[PDB]
Amino acid sequence: DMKIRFWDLAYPERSYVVAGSTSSPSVSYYRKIIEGTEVVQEIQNKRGPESLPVGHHDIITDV
């Protein structure tokens, strides 16, 4: 999805997206317990031209 995410494993609600423009819908992170596993789910929140997107436009293969 070409998004560089930062997951705060100790404080999941502080997880955020690094790369990806602010014009894309913001996200929230919820720690849940599904089978017993704790899951940090990411949920979508329902100067000249716009600054050029700095993010990747193709699959990010590595970090």
Partner: protein, 184 residues
């Protein structure tokens, strides 16, 4: 008997993945041709926009000579020596660097090229930049222009790090066959 059926099924899966991969290869090749067609239309459209930009709004023309942008009243020296401003020559310099920066910022958006040095049009507006502040601002512009020339595969033999509008001219002219191309 189960190993027999396993060999039968496994023989089919080998044939299935082999023909499935051929469809993937055909599809990928077919879409790479289509992708190349998208890139050339995008390169022709970008070039069409840059030509219209540099013919109606920001015509860069030749006037040791001088180079003009947006008309001959606005000129920079080819040597790159803007020494007069640090020391009306200042207005011509400010205007030329203003439209050059504005143009570079529009070229960056037409070409979708991330400019290495953050430089804003307004940096060449407002009170006369100090010698120190101006020089770094000019270096940013020169670095952006050179970066754009590299991105667009302008002949390096023609570029020099100091000539501001001379490089944009090389970047803009129809001689720039690769202008608009998105590639390494």
């Amino acid at each position: 008997q189960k190993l027999y059926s396993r060999a039968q099924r496994h023989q089919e899966k080998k044939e299935k993945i082999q023909r499935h991969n051929r469809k993937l290869g055909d599809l990928v090749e077919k879409k790479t041709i289509d992708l190349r067609s998208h890139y050339e239309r995008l390169a022709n459209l970008r070039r069409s926009h840059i030509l219209e930009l540099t013919s109606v709004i920001f015509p860069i023309e030749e006037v040791d000579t001088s180079i003009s942008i947006t008309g001959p009243w606005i000129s920079l020296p080819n040597n790159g020596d803007y020494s007069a401003y640090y020391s009306n020559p200042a207005y011509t310099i400010s205007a030329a660097l203003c439209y050059a920066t504005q143009l570079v910022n529009i070229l960056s958006h037409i070409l979708d090229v991330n400019l290495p040095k953050k430089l804003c049009n307004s940096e060449f507006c407002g009170e006369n930049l100090s010698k120190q502040k101006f020089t770094r601002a000019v270096k940013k512009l020169n670095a952006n222009i050179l970066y754009l020339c590299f991105s667009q595969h302008v002949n390096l033999d023609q570029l020099q790090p100091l000539h501001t509008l001379r490089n944009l001219m090389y970047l803009v002219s129809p001689s720039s066959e690769h202008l608009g191309r998105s590639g390494p």
